[PDB]
Amino acid sequence: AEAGITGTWYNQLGSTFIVTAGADGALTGTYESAVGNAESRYVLTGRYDSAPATDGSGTALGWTVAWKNNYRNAHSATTWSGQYVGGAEARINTQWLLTSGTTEANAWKSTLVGHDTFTKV
Amino acid sequence: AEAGITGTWYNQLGSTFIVTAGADGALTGTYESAVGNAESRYVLTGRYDSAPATDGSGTALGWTVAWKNNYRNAHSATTWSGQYVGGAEARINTQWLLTSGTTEANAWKSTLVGHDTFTKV
Amino acid sequence: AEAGITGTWYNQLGSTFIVTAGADGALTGTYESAVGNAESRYVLTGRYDSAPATDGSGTALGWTVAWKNNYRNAHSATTWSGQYVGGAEARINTQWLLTSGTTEANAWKSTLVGHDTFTKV
Amino acid sequence: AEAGITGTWYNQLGSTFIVTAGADGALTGTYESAVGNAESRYVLTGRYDSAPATDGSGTALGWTVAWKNNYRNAHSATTWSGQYVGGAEARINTQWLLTSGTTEANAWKSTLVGHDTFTKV
Ligand SMILES: O=C(O)CCCC[C@@H]1SC[C@@H]2NC(=O)N[C@@H]21
Ligand SMILES: O=C(O)CCCC[C@@H]1SC[C@@H]2NC(=O)N[C@@H]21
Ligand SMILES: O=C(O)CCCC[C@@H]1SC[C@@H]2NC(=O)N[C@@H]21
Ligand SMILES: O=C(O)CCCC[C@@H]1SC[C@@H]2NC(=O)N[C@@H]21
């Protein structure tokens, strides 16, 4: 879903996800979080199923953002794993994992889990 | 950890992860799974904290693989979120999310969760 | 939130959760799934924060269901971890982990992850 | 695995899990954490597959601990979802979700994810 995926999306927190789906299954763009140890735009890189089944199932995809830009460094990375669902109201349903660089003593508590829903709004 | 991260790594299942850490916090390479609906090498893309804290904490990183290559298409994507830990025995500790494109009726069961440990072996 | 938590709840899939919150932080009841390898009612057991903060934060709680009753056995267990949020429209926001008994060769793929929202409806 | 499961177990962090597996698929016992906002013993409640497959697959199980005892209250709950694996070196492989009661503004970051391995040691 190159055409489909490409665009500007917003999640339930007001975060902005600007993507471009390459023909070769590549995802590139920008991410800006409405919350956490972040400010402005961050670079994102990902991959998506460029030849989705024809039975009307969603398109599997994922992307990563290392929380470092010119303004700051949170020393953490988030990965979103979900599927794209086309139609009237297109959506991107995901689950994410946010990992903080920690000392070994604190690795037990290095990762958060949640889910975000994106819509063209 | 450009030097550190760059290399060939193996996880507890015998999977092979070949990465190159760019100066700009970019991760590119190849992934080959010892299990699941996969065969041969797949393209990977990710990001890592290119300016890790100096207190000896790990380096946050993540990558994605869309399970499609010339030989097959599993119509799924995996995202690994973890941290790189340097030293005598360098390691990459991660947690992953594997999402399958599904119909809406089956979205409840679209995603698996697990953890992989990588070592230069 | 004994009074609050006690009751019949439904999630986004039409599943029914009948709980009783004991004074001692115990949760007991029945669970019936609208999907998966299940039928009829299953026993549940859990625990909740019986002395929640007074700043208006949610109440942390969790419960488990081993997918075996008189009618069947799916040889799996689900654990829901979330928080109770009181008010006009009371809700229970959770994340769950569903683990299937597997052989060692297949342990990599033994666990699913998702989220359910419950309301008195 | 009543006999099998019943006992004292330790995870990779030095935490102690004392369980009793009831004939009816009930789990009761005590949990004491070597880390986090905890001290002494906490009550646990869970469920397990009391009639596991005969093909030598693991036994699915889960338990919860609300982090409140006489000494303190962390206003959080953990749920462990895994499987019991019998034999020479019996093990309990799990994944857990730790949820903190939070305000709505901070719900995005309410839950941690990790994995623990238990052995009779
Ligand atoms: O605190 C940092 O380490 C930066 C966190 C960035 C915000 C997180 S990523 C998951 C969730 N979805 C969003 O759009 N924002 C939060
Ligand atoms: O079945 C497919 O959809 C392909 C799955 C690929 C294998 C998974 S990704 C998580 C885990 N870590 C690995 O190295 N392999 C498995
Ligand atoms: O297939 C089995 O092993 C039984 C699965 C039971 C249904 C799951 S538990 C998570 C999700 N929430 C529900 O209410 N039902 C599904
Ligand atoms: O900080 C609190 O809220 C109490 C946390 C208790 C410790 C956690 S539960 C997951 C992990 N496994 C353990 O044995 N201890 C930690």
Side-chain angles (χ1 to χ4, degrees), chain C residues 49-66:
Chain C
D49 176 4
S50 65
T54 299
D55 62 4
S57 299
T59 300
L61 91 182
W63 77 90
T64 315
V65 170

Side-chain angles (χ1 to χ4, degrees), chain A residues 45 49 75 81 83 99 102, chain B residues 45 49 73 75 81 83 99 102:
Chain A
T45 202
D49 176 4
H75 303 302
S81 181
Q83 63 183 135
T99 306
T102 67
Chain B
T45 202
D49 176 4
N73 189 346
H75 303 302
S81 181
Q83 63 183 135
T99 306
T102 67

Side-chain angles (χ1 to χ4, degrees), chain B residues 9-93:
Chain B
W9 302 82
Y10 310 89
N11 73 11
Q12 79 291 342
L13 301 165
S15 297
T16 302
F17 170 49
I18 301 166
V19 250
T20 313
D24 59 327
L27 294 180
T28 75
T30 259
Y31 200 96
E32 162 169 14
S33 194
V35 306
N37 196 196
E39 77 183 87
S40 205
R41 31 232 216 188
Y42 300 80
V43 161
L44 76 83
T45 202
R47 300 285 300 167
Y48 76 105
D49 176 4
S50 65
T54 299
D55 62 4
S57 299
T59 300
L61 91 182
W63 77 90
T64 315
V65 170
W67 306 100
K68 165 178 188 305
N69 70 7
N70 279 309
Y71 317 100
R72 60 219 253 196
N73 189 346
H75 303 302
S76 62
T78 304
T79 73
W80 286 264
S81 181
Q83 63 183 135
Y84 163 74
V85 178
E89 312 296 332
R91 247 137 161 50
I92 301 183
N93 298 319

Side-chain angles (χ1 to χ4, degrees), chain C residues 25 27 43-53 55-66 68 73 75-83 85 95-104 107 110-111, chain D residues 25 27 43-53 55-66 68 73 75-83 85 95-104 107 110-111:
Chain C
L27 294 180
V43 161
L44 76 83
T45 202
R47 300 285 300 167
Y48 76 105
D49 176 4
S50 65
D55 62 4
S57 299
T59 300
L61 91 182
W63 77 90
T64 315
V65 170
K68 165 178 188 305
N73 189 346
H75 303 302
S76 62
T78 304
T79 73
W80 286 264
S81 181
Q83 63 183 135
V85 178
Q95 300 210 246
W96 52 256
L97 293 174
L98 165 50
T99 306
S100 282
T102 67
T103 60
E104 319 183 353
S110 61
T111 320
Chain D
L27 294 180
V43 161
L44 76 83
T45 202
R47 300 285 300 167
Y48 76 105
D49 176 4
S50 65
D55 62 4
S57 299
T59 300
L61 91 182
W63 77 90
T64 315
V65 170
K68 165 178 188 305
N73 189 346
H75 303 302
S76 62
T78 304
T79 73
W80 286 264
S81 181
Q83 63 183 135
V85 178
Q95 300 210 246
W96 52 256
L97 293 174
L98 165 50
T99 306
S100 282
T102 67
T103 60
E104 319 183 353
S110 61
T111 320

Side-chain angles (χ1 to χ4, degrees), chain A residues 108, chain D residues 11 13 15 31 33 35-37 67 74 76 78 80 96 98 116:
Chain A
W108 70 270
Chain D
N11 73 11
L13 301 165
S15 297
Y31 200 96
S33 194
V35 306
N37 196 196
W67 306 100
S76 62
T78 304
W80 286 264
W96 52 256
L98 165 50
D116 294 344

